[PDB]
Amino acid sequence: NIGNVSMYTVTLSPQTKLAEEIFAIKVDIASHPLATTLIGEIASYFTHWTGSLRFSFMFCGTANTTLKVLLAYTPPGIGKPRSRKEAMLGTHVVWDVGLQSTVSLVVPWISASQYRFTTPDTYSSAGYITCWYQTNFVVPPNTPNTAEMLCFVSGCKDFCLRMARDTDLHKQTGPITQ
Amino acid sequence: GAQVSRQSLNYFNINYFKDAASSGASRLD
Amino acid sequence: GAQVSRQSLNYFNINYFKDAASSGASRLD
Amino acid sequence: GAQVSRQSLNYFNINYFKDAASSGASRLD
Amino acid sequence: NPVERYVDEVLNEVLVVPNINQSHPTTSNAAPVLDAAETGHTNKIQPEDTIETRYVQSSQTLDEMSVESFLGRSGCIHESVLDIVDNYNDQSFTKWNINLQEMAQIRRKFEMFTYARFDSEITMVPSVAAKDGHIGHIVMQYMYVPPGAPIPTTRDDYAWQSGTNASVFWQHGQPFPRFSLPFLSIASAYYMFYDGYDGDTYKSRYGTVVTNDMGTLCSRIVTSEQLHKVKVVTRIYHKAKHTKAWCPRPPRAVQYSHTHTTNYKLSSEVHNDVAIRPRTNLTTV
Amino acid sequence: NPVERYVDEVLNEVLVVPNINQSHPTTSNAAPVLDAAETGHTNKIQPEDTIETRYVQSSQTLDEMSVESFLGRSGCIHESVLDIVDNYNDQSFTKWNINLQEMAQIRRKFEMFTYARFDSEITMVPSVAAKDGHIGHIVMQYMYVPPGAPIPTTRDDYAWQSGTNASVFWQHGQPFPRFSLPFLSIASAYYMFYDGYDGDTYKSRYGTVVTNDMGTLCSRIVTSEQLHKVKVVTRIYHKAKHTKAWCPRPPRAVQYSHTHTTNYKLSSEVHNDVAIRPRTNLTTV
Amino acid sequence: SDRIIQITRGDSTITSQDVANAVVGYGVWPHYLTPQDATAIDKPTQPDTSSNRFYTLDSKMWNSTSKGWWWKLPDALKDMGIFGENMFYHFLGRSGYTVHVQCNASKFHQGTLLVVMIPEHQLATVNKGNVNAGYKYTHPGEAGREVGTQVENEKQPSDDNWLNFDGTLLGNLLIFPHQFINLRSNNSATLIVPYVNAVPMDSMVRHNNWSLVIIPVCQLQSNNISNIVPITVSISPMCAEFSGARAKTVVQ
Amino acid sequence: SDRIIQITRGDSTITSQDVANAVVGYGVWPHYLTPQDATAIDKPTQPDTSSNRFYTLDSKMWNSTSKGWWWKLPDALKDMGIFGENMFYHFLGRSGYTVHVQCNASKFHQGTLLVVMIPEHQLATVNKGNVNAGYKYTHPGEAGREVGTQVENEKQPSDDNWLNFDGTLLGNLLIFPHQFINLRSNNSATLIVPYVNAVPMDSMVRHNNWSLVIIPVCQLQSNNISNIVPITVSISPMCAEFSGARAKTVVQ
Ligand SMILES: Cc1cc(CCCOc2c(C)cc(-c3nnn(C)n3)cc2C)on1
Ligand SMILES: Cc1cc(CCCOc2c(C)cc(-c3nnn(C)n3)cc2C)on1
Ligand SMILES: *C(=O)CCCCCCCCCCCCC
Ligand SMILES: *C(=O)CCCCCCCCCCCCC
Ligand SMILES: *C(=O)CCCCCCCCCCCCC
Ligand SMILES: [Zn+2]
């Protein structure tokens, strides 16, 4: 998908098994796939970060497509949840798709230390975000059986970066000439 | 070039040269 | 950065740079 | 470390370091 | 109070982040978590809105994230080389068409904005390599030749007289030269990007080359020919002071190829050209 | 009065020790000399309680015994070597994973506390050994690479541009470089000891390595290759300023073997591993 | 909008853009036990946010032949995080609940679920004399019971949905706190119930205070039957407090 | 009497008629985290009486050859009722403790135990290069560690009691909160310690804040050696609060 706009969408569709997993990523601000987002790029110019993150999701299905999804944040000290029941025990939002297309999940700053390293560090890994089917993708007849979803990220009022450093997300392997 | 404040805690924001470009980093906001 | 005291015996506790880390050894107690 | 006198003929007996041993020659009598 | 403000400067507590307030369980028909990204606005939901928070006093400051701080760090923008090989008269002087596009590190930071206005601090770091053993007495001359002024064509050109141009002379052994430069543009801000041409024909130039001409930096070893050959490399460092920036933009995602242009090259395997690391699949963290 | 306080600073009489008061013979059923160490408290008996003392005015001060004084002395923490032998490009630069555990003298002092918070003053002492005779013009670059920033892999790596990282350039002949560093931890204090792991598996790391990552110090001789080879040794000295310490502990009794760990080695004759000198017997002074 | 709802409990937030208001059982909002009504004298433990949060049970599939489902509280939550732990480590417990039933379909689907909260739903056995429902059968846990599936055993409870599994007619269930999930109108039901009992606190292991019963009164129908229409239940304890701490009770 | 003590915590009360006062580590009584020192933003769960109670560990036998014992906190309590459950269900935890060591003998017995509470007792390995103590060895649980019994393994910590298992001399352990159980004087030791750390809250699964070390400095002796003289430890968390709730962490 890299090099295609499709790398920005997640596809949803009618399930035959209940509570299936949709996606899972690390919450660490400078880890992949968060790294190249504007907040990830800026965080990579700093060594420390703190604050809560805001993840939003916009559904792109038809106006007649319904769906309920469970978005969960799993604080560290445990592996990523293996089931919806496991994820549901942590911080979560049950998103009901309707007139308002977008929902937001806030990943609270839950850490031992006041700051964490932006670079991948075992001691400061922040946890995971997983998405599961709460009910199911349902559509009427004659309606596309798949739909896309867009994912956004930005920082909350408490977001803060510290100790400026050069970024590792861009390099120069030769002279830049005229 | 001296901005002398008093509080005593006196501040001396001296500007050693006569061009604005010569001064150090700007204050914030 | 000047803490001017008077007694005359005037004290000038100057802080030459703008970051607290830059100052010398701390006072005691 | 500044002993500022006035007469105007102002005297500035500055002590640049924080230890008494650091100062120069003593006054007499 | 300028003194209170001063204390904030020393402690770096000018811009404080807000506290987190205690929240409680809710059952309402007002759903802050629901919104519409179509509007082009970011939902301003905060942690207190989605979970039960405790009260926490924030002590973090945003000072270091200021534009002044971000761009107020001296970085290398040019490496000037004067290598005496076999002809002193020809190899003892050189020139550079000034620009902030040759070094990726600072270029990428400035280019995160569309327009920027700032004063410049230039610091030079000359290092004399003794190729044959001794270095003698090296004295350098760095002359700024604004567009239009005569560019020296020989090491003893009359232009070196610097009757009006600003020249900086450095003597080996003395501290690194440094000087400031006021905002130089003929416009109100420097163009980081320019979607325009210097004409309306197929051969008109495109981009910042049209608007960002800063002139020429001409250097020369003032000292006359010496027995032992040397290689003088002068690294120019630039820092922005008293900065202002307008219209932020996405950071450069691929390597730079040339100055004054956004041009880039792509390989057959584009994932190698960007910093994105391929995922095994959607659920593999 | 800040002026009176100032005088105390100059005379080093901020913390005075109490006087000894005159005491007299006693015959009482209150026996201060008797107590119970089981309680975990030290009997606060003083000389006046066990003998007949005279009055004596104390003039001793405890200023020098302050934590600020104890840890406020610059000591060597690293010896960086750049030895040009046969390959300038490879031997003209190096890197060090920063820590205060490699030199016993300062390490032992900081480790007499469990947590410590302080600002740092770094002073560097570069010495250029002329292996072949001349030293030419040596210019050094010390770049601080915070964890995450790109580490240079060649002497001309783009990372050396230092577009954001803090770099210090020194020119041979100029005074010793020196700068200050604010308290760097992501926590409220530095861990001198840490009874924890970075995970819960048999292969998780143990100790301060988990919490004390300060990044990397990358050095390079800025000067290009010279005829005569040199050996540059840069000694880094560190001093704590504005110090605070918590929970004192026993001093290291045996030699250190590695960084970030309390590990030690014992010989077959342990009395040789500790500073205790064997006594002939209980009554031989 | 009156069609929208957001319920936040602890670290969980639930939304629905198509609600039919909410019901507060008997008009009483859940609350902690007061000293005038208390009897046990030890200080209660109140886990607060770690127990008073939404727990999502196993989803069920609704199809043209479904007869109904039922769960019992607090049994259904016995294995749910801190709430579960507390009910087994303590003799006495007390709690209220926010029950949120979820079920979305489409504007071309039809069907109606009757969602009821019954206090003291003492189940009956059919044609088995005076043999009563066995402990195991009235304690299915989060799985609940799918009416009309279980292979009969002697102690098996009644599966007659029309007789409320207890000898009373289905049509009169409306006398209990309830709501309907009529697919053309709403996609969820929310009921907040207070603690109801003849004693201030009780054993959560042997006494089920409330029973959640869901009976489809209008058959699910559409012209796209292959699309599965699940029913998901999320329950959040409220003002949970426990007393009489000891070792953990292990059942069976 | 100054020889008597009664400590009540939750549903537990402990007594001793022969104490040597009590020690409050660093003179600070345990207390809940204040909003100025906090960093994690979710509301903490405070179990109160169900977690802040005395938990008695496995007793040990003290004999003429015993070299010592040590337990680490909160590890030693990981499997103790509600406190244990909370430390695994939450990422962050915070707590203080009341440690009561018990050991009675007779007026014809002699011996002295040095009871110490060490903050950040980072154990060392002997003659094993830079190989550090393995997770499993620094997490013995309620069983603690009997010094001088374990068959050495590579990741096995030091068992040198005279070098504090960390390269420092035993005689200087007194710089840490401590007490002595001198059989002629007292039959118990009580130490109350506050939460000590460089961060307001931490992972109780991977960071042991305090270490309880008991070293017999005066050999147990009597003329009735057949009578076994045990050492029993009872520890009570204080102001325990947890944050960052999720599923239960399972270690190993
Ligand atoms: C946009 C934008 C802004 C700038 C100006 C950069 C400053 O350029 C220089 C430099 C690097 C050196 C000298 C220089 N060196 N030595 N002297 C006497 N002047 C003069 C200018 C204008 O370039 N592009
Ligand atoms: C605990 C604890 C505290 C510290 C920090 C020590 C300071 O470390 C350095 C040193 C020695 C040099 C530089 C350095 N050298 N040159 N520059 C530009 N920065 C930066 C740091 C953080 O290390 N462990
Ligand atoms: C500002 O425009 C002029 C800057 C002058 C630089 C000199 C600053 C030192 C002044 C010392 C005067 C002492 C007062 C009696
Ligand atoms: C403090 O914030 C600024 C420090 C200023 C350094 C200059 C100190 C010398 C001041 C001399 C002024 C003489 C007064 C007329
Ligand atoms: C004495 O204790 C401190 C010594 C301070 C040395 C600096 C002296 C120069 C002071 C210039 C201040 C000018 C006044 C506005
Ligand atoms: Zn020579």
mmCIF file with all atom_site columns, N, CA and C in Angstrom, chain E residues 122-167:
data_model
loop_
_atom_site.group_PDB
_atom_site.id
_atom_site.type_symbol
_atom_site.label_atom_id
_atom_site.label_alt_id
_atom_site.label_comp_id
_atom_site.label_asym_id
_atom_site.label_entity_id
_atom_site.label_seq_id
_atom_site.pdbx_PDB_ins_code
_atom_site.Cartn_x
_atom_site.Cartn_y
_atom_site.Cartn_z
_atom_site.occupancy
_atom_site.B_iso_or_equiv
_atom_site.pdbx_formal_charge
_atom_site.auth_seq_id
_atom_site.auth_comp_id
_atom_site.auth_asym_id
_atom_site.auth_atom_id
_atom_site.pdbx_PDB_model_num
ATOM 1   N N  . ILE E 1 122 ? 25.879 34.672 11.979  1.00 0.00 ? 122 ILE E N  1
ATOM 2   C CA . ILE E 1 122 ? 26.787 33.807 11.253  1.00 0.00 ? 122 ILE E CA 1
ATOM 3   C C  . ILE E 1 122 ? 28.036 33.581 12.091  1.00 0.00 ? 122 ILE E C  1
ATOM 4   N N  . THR E 1 123 ? 28.424 32.322 12.244  1.00 0.00 ? 123 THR E N  1
ATOM 5   C CA . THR E 1 123 ? 29.633 31.982 12.982  1.00 0.00 ? 123 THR E CA 1
ATOM 6   C C  . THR E 1 123 ? 30.445 31.115 12.030  1.00 0.00 ? 123 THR E C  1
ATOM 7   N N  . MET E 1 124 ? 31.735 31.399 11.900  1.00 0.00 ? 124 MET E N  1
ATOM 8   C CA . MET E 1 124 ? 32.592 30.632 11.013  1.00 0.00 ? 124 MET E CA 1
ATOM 9   C C  . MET E 1 124 ? 33.622 29.831 11.777  1.00 0.00 ? 124 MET E C  1
ATOM 10  N N  . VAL E 1 125 ? 33.836 28.600 11.330  1.00 0.00 ? 125 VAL E N  1
ATOM 11  C CA . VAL E 1 125 ? 34.800 27.714 11.963  1.00 0.00 ? 125 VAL E CA 1
ATOM 12  C C  . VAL E 1 125 ? 35.859 27.283 10.948  1.00 0.00 ? 125 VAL E C  1
ATOM 13  N N  . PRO E 1 126 ? 36.963 28.034 10.850  1.00 0.00 ? 126 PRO E N  1
ATOM 14  C CA . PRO E 1 126 ? 38.049 27.705 9.921   1.00 0.00 ? 126 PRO E CA 1
ATOM 15  C C  . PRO E 1 126 ? 39.018 26.684 10.517  1.00 0.00 ? 126 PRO E C  1
ATOM 16  N N  . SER E 1 127 ? 39.406 25.691 9.727   1.00 0.00 ? 127 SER E N  1
ATOM 17  C CA . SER E 1 127 ? 40.378 24.709 10.190  1.00 0.00 ? 127 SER E CA 1
ATOM 18  C C  . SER E 1 127 ? 41.405 24.577 9.077   1.00 0.00 ? 127 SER E C  1
ATOM 19  N N  . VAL E 1 128 ? 42.669 24.783 9.439   1.00 0.00 ? 128 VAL E N  1
ATOM 20  C CA . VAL E 1 128 ? 43.788 24.722 8.508   1.00 0.00 ? 128 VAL E CA 1
ATOM 21  C C  . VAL E 1 128 ? 44.525 23.390 8.614   1.00 0.00 ? 128 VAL E C  1
ATOM 22  N N  . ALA E 1 129 ? 44.452 22.591 7.554   1.00 0.00 ? 129 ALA E N  1
ATOM 23  C CA . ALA E 1 129 ? 45.132 21.302 7.533   1.00 0.00 ? 129 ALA E CA 1
ATOM 24  C C  . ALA E 1 129 ? 46.539 21.493 6.972   1.00 0.00 ? 129 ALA E C  1
ATOM 25  N N  . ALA E 1 130 ? 47.546 21.113 7.758   1.00 0.00 ? 130 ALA E N  1
ATOM 26  C CA . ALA E 1 130 ? 48.935 21.225 7.330   1.00 0.00 ? 130 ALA E CA 1
ATOM 27  C C  . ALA E 1 130 ? 49.266 20.010 6.458   1.00 0.00 ? 130 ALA E C  1
ATOM 28  N N  . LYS E 1 131 ? 49.104 20.174 5.150   1.00 0.00 ? 131 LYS E N  1
ATOM 29  C CA . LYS E 1 131 ? 49.358 19.094 4.211   1.00 0.00 ? 131 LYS E CA 1
ATOM 30  C C  . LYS E 1 131 ? 50.843 18.747 4.123   1.00 0.00 ? 131 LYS E C  1
ATOM 31  N N  . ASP E 1 132 ? 51.701 19.763 4.198   1.00 0.00 ? 132 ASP E N  1
ATOM 32  C CA . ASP E 1 132 ? 53.141 19.558 4.105   1.00 0.00 ? 132 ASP E CA 1
ATOM 33  C C  . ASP E 1 132 ? 53.871 19.674 5.439   1.00 0.00 ? 132 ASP E C  1
ATOM 34  N N  . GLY E 1 133 ? 53.151 19.941 6.530   1.00 0.00 ? 133 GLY E N  1
ATOM 35  C CA . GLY E 1 133 ? 53.839 20.034 7.812   1.00 0.00 ? 133 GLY E CA 1
ATOM 36  C C  . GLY E 1 133 ? 53.630 21.279 8.663   1.00 0.00 ? 133 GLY E C  1
ATOM 37  N N  . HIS E 1 134 ? 53.953 22.460 8.137   1.00 0.00 ? 134 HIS E N  1
ATOM 38  C CA . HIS E 1 134 ? 53.742 23.693 8.904   1.00 0.00 ? 134 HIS E CA 1
ATOM 39  C C  . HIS E 1 134 ? 52.558 24.457 8.304   1.00 0.00 ? 134 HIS E C  1
ATOM 40  N N  . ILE E 1 135 ? 51.977 25.394 9.065   1.00 0.00 ? 135 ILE E N  1
ATOM 41  C CA . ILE E 1 135 ? 50.856 26.186 8.540   1.00 0.00 ? 135 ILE E CA 1
ATOM 42  C C  . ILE E 1 135 ? 51.216 27.668 8.425   1.00 0.00 ? 135 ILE E C  1
ATOM 43  N N  . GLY E 1 136 ? 52.340 28.064 9.018   1.00 0.00 ? 136 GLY E N  1
ATOM 44  C CA . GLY E 1 136 ? 52.744 29.458 8.934   1.00 0.00 ? 136 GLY E CA 1
ATOM 45  C C  . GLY E 1 136 ? 51.766 30.397 9.610   1.00 0.00 ? 136 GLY E C  1
ATOM 46  N N  . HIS E 1 137 ? 51.535 31.547 8.993   1.00 0.00 ? 137 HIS E N  1
ATOM 47  C CA . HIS E 1 137 ? 50.616 32.528 9.557   1.00 0.00 ? 137 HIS E CA 1
ATOM 48  C C  . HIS E 1 137 ? 49.442 32.704 8.609   1.00 0.00 ? 137 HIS E C  1
ATOM 49  N N  . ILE E 1 138 ? 48.333 32.040 8.908   1.00 0.00 ? 138 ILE E N  1
ATOM 50  C CA . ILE E 1 138 ? 47.154 32.118 8.056   1.00 0.00 ? 138 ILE E CA 1
ATOM 51  C C  . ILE E 1 138 ? 46.192 33.231 8.454   1.00 0.00 ? 138 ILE E C  1
ATOM 52  N N  . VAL E 1 139 ? 45.909 34.126 7.512   1.00 0.00 ? 139 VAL E N  1
ATOM 53  C CA . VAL E 1 139 ? 44.971 35.223 7.726   1.00 0.00 ? 139 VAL E CA 1
ATOM 54  C C  . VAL E 1 139 ? 43.947 35.087 6.606   1.00 0.00 ? 139 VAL E C  1
ATOM 55  N N  . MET E 1 140 ? 42.668 35.021 6.969   1.00 0.00 ? 140 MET E N  1
ATOM 56  C CA . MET E 1 140 ? 41.583 34.868 6.001   1.00 0.00 ? 140 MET E CA 1
ATOM 57  C C  . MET E 1 140 ? 40.754 36.131 5.810   1.00 0.00 ? 140 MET E C  1
ATOM 58  N N  . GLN E 1 141 ? 40.163 36.270 4.630   1.00 0.00 ? 141 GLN E N  1
ATOM 59  C CA . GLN E 1 141 ? 39.291 37.401 4.347   1.00 0.00 ? 141 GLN E CA 1
ATOM 60  C C  . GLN E 1 141 ? 38.002 36.854 3.753   1.00 0.00 ? 141 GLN E C  1
ATOM 61  N N  . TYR E 1 142 ? 36.883 37.178 4.387   1.00 0.00 ? 142 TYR E N  1
ATOM 62  C CA . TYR E 1 142 ? 35.581 36.753 3.914   1.00 0.00 ? 142 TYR E CA 1
ATOM 63  C C  . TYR E 1 142 ? 34.857 38.036 3.538   1.00 0.00 ? 142 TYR E C  1
ATOM 64  N N  . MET E 1 143 ? 34.620 38.237 2.249   1.00 0.00 ? 143 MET E N  1
ATOM 65  C CA . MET E 1 143 ? 33.955 39.444 1.792   1.00 0.00 ? 143 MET E CA 1
ATOM 66  C C  . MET E 1 143 ? 32.568 39.163 1.248   1.00 0.00 ? 143 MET E C  1
ATOM 67  N N  . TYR E 1 144 ? 31.589 39.929 1.713   1.00 0.00 ? 144 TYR E N  1
ATOM 68  C CA . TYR E 1 144 ? 30.223 39.756 1.250   1.00 0.00 ? 144 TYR E CA 1
ATOM 69  C C  . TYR E 1 144 ? 30.013 40.661 0.050   1.00 0.00 ? 144 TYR E C  1
ATOM 70  N N  . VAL E 1 145 ? 29.721 40.050 -1.089  1.00 0.00 ? 145 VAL E N  1
ATOM 71  C CA . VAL E 1 145 ? 29.508 40.799 -2.311  1.00 0.00 ? 145 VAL E CA 1
ATOM 72  C C  . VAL E 1 145 ? 28.030 40.783 -2.670  1.00 0.00 ? 145 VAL E C  1
ATOM 73  N N  . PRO E 1 146 ? 27.303 41.863 -2.327  1.00 0.00 ? 146 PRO E N  1
ATOM 74  C CA . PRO E 1 146 ? 25.873 41.958 -2.626  1.00 0.00 ? 146 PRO E CA 1
ATOM 75  C C  . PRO E 1 146 ? 25.661 41.887 -4.135  1.00 0.00 ? 146 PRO E C  1
ATOM 76  N N  . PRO E 1 147 ? 24.497 41.387 -4.566  1.00 0.00 ? 147 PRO E N  1
ATOM 77  C CA . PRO E 1 147 ? 24.252 41.306 -6.005  1.00 0.00 ? 147 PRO E CA 1
ATOM 78  C C  . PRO E 1 147 ? 24.495 42.641 -6.710  1.00 0.00 ? 147 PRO E C  1
ATOM 79  N N  . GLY E 1 148 ? 25.393 42.630 -7.690  1.00 0.00 ? 148 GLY E N  1
ATOM 80  C CA . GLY E 1 148 ? 25.700 43.838 -8.427  1.00 0.00 ? 148 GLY E CA 1
ATOM 81  C C  . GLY E 1 148 ? 27.135 44.295 -8.242  1.00 0.00 ? 148 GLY E C  1
ATOM 82  N N  . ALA E 1 149 ? 27.673 44.100 -7.040  1.00 0.00 ? 149 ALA E N  1
ATOM 83  C CA . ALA E 1 149 ? 29.044 44.505 -6.760  1.00 0.00 ? 149 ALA E CA 1
ATOM 84  C C  . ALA E 1 149 ? 29.987 43.617 -7.566  1.00 0.00 ? 149 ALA E C  1
ATOM 85  N N  . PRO E 1 150 ? 31.160 44.145 -7.946  1.00 0.00 ? 150 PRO E N  1
ATOM 86  C CA . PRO E 1 150 ? 32.142 43.381 -8.722  1.00 0.00 ? 150 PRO E CA 1
ATOM 87  C C  . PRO E 1 150 ? 32.690 42.160 -7.985  1.00 0.00 ? 150 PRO E C  1
ATOM 88  N N  . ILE E 1 151 ? 32.633 40.998 -8.623  1.00 0.00 ? 151 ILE E N  1
ATOM 89  C CA . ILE E 1 151 ? 33.162 39.774 -8.033  1.00 0.00 ? 151 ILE E CA 1
ATOM 90  C C  . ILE E 1 151 ? 34.638 39.647 -8.424  1.00 0.00 ? 151 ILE E C  1
ATOM 91  N N  . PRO E 1 152 ? 35.524 39.456 -7.439  1.00 0.00 ? 152 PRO E N  1
ATOM 92  C CA . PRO E 1 152 ? 36.955 39.331 -7.735  1.00 0.00 ? 152 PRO E CA 1
ATOM 93  C C  . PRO E 1 152 ? 37.243 38.115 -8.614  1.00 0.00 ? 152 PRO E C  1
ATOM 94  N N  . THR E 1 153 ? 38.104 38.288 -9.613  1.00 0.00 ? 153 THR E N  1
ATOM 95  C CA . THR E 1 153 ? 38.452 37.175 -10.495 1.00 0.00 ? 153 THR E CA 1
ATOM 96  C C  . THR E 1 153 ? 39.871 36.654 -10.257 1.00 0.00 ? 153 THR E C  1
ATOM 97  N N  . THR E 1 154 ? 40.629 37.320 -9.387  1.00 0.00 ? 154 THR E N  1
ATOM 98  C CA . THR E 1 154 ? 41.995 36.898 -9.056  1.00 0.00 ? 154 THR E CA 1
ATOM 99  C C  . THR E 1 154 ? 42.212 37.154 -7.575  1.00 0.00 ? 154 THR E C  1
ATOM 100 N N  . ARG E 1 155 ? 43.233 36.546 -6.980  1.00 0.00 ? 155 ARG E N  1
ATOM 101 C CA . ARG E 1 155 ? 43.463 36.740 -5.556  1.00 0.00 ? 155 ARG E CA 1
ATOM 102 C C  . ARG E 1 155 ? 43.916 38.148 -5.189  1.00 0.00 ? 155 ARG E C  1
ATOM 103 N N  . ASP E 1 156 ? 44.283 38.956 -6.182  1.00 0.00 ? 156 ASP E N  1
ATOM 104 C CA . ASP E 1 156 ? 44.715 40.327 -5.908  1.00 0.00 ? 156 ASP E CA 1
ATOM 105 C C  . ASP E 1 156 ? 43.824 41.347 -6.601  1.00 0.00 ? 156 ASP E C  1
ATOM 106 N N  . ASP E 1 157 ? 42.639 40.897 -6.990  1.00 0.00 ? 157 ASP E N  1
ATOM 107 C CA . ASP E 1 157 ? 41.657 41.749 -7.640  1.00 0.00 ? 157 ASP E CA 1
ATOM 108 C C  . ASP E 1 157 ? 41.401 43.012 -6.797  1.00 0.00 ? 157 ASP E C  1
ATOM 109 N N  . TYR E 1 158 ? 41.155 44.138 -7.451  1.00 0.00 ? 158 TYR E N  1
ATOM 110 C CA . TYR E 1 158 ? 40.907 45.374 -6.722  1.00 0.00 ? 158 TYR E CA 1
ATOM 111 C C  . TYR E 1 158 ? 39.665 45.284 -5.832  1.00 0.00 ? 158 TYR E C  1
ATOM 112 N N  . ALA E 1 159 ? 38.729 44.414 -6.195  1.00 0.00 ? 159 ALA E N  1
ATOM 113 C CA . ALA E 1 159 ? 37.511 44.250 -5.417  1.00 0.00 ? 159 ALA E CA 1
ATOM 114 C C  . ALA E 1 159 ? 37.818 43.873 -3.962  1.00 0.00 ? 159 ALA E C  1
ATOM 115 N N  . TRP E 1 160 ? 38.954 43.223 -3.735  1.00 0.00 ? 160 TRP E N  1
ATOM 116 C CA . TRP E 1 160 ? 39.328 42.808 -2.388  1.00 0.00 ? 160 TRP E CA 1
ATOM 117 C C  . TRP E 1 160 ? 39.589 43.999 -1.472  1.00 0.00 ? 160 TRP E C  1
ATOM 118 N N  . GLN E 1 161 ? 39.736 45.189 -2.050  1.00 0.00 ? 161 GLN E N  1
ATOM 119 C CA . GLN E 1 161 ? 39.968 46.400 -1.257  1.00 0.00 ? 161 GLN E CA 1
ATOM 120 C C  . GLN E 1 161 ? 38.822 46.609 -0.265  1.00 0.00 ? 161 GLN E C  1
ATOM 121 N N  . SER E 1 162 ? 37.639 46.100 -0.612  1.00 0.00 ? 162 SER E N  1
ATOM 122 C CA . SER E 1 162 ? 36.447 46.199 0.233   1.00 0.00 ? 162 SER E CA 1
ATOM 123 C C  . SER E 1 162 ? 36.163 47.633 0.687   1.00 0.00 ? 162 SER E C  1
ATOM 124 N N  . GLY E 1 163 ? 36.234 48.566 -0.253  1.00 0.00 ? 163 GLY E N  1
ATOM 125 C CA . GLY E 1 163 ? 35.995 49.957 0.070   1.00 0.00 ? 163 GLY E CA 1
ATOM 126 C C  . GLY E 1 163 ? 34.606 50.231 0.601   1.00 0.00 ? 163 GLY E C  1
ATOM 127 N N  . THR E 1 164 ? 33.664 49.339 0.311   1.00 0.00 ? 164 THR E N  1
ATOM 128 C CA . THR E 1 164 ? 32.300 49.516 0.773   1.00 0.00 ? 164 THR E CA 1
ATOM 129 C C  . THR E 1 164 ? 31.686 48.221 1.289   1.00 0.00 ? 164 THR E C  1
ATOM 130 N N  . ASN E 1 165 ? 32.018 47.100 0.657   1.00 0.00 ? 165 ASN E N  1
ATOM 131 C CA . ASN E 1 165 ? 31.478 45.804 1.072   1.00 0.00 ? 165 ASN E CA 1
ATOM 132 C C  . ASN E 1 165 ? 31.970 45.456 2.458   1.00 0.00 ? 165 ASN E C  1
ATOM 133 N N  . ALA E 1 166 ? 31.219 44.619 3.158   1.00 0.00 ? 166 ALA E N  1
ATOM 134 C CA . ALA E 1 166 ? 31.621 44.200 4.483   1.00 0.00 ? 166 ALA E CA 1
ATOM 135 C C  . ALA E 1 166 ? 32.564 42.998 4.370   1.00 0.00 ? 166 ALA E C  1
ATOM 136 N N  . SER E 1 167 ? 33.738 43.110 4.978   1.00 0.00 ? 167 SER E N  1
ATOM 137 C CA . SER E 1 167 ? 34.714 42.031 4.978   1.00 0.00 ? 167 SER E CA 1
ATOM 138 C C  . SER E 1 167 ? 35.038 41.703 6.423   1.00 0.00 ? 167 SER E C  1
#
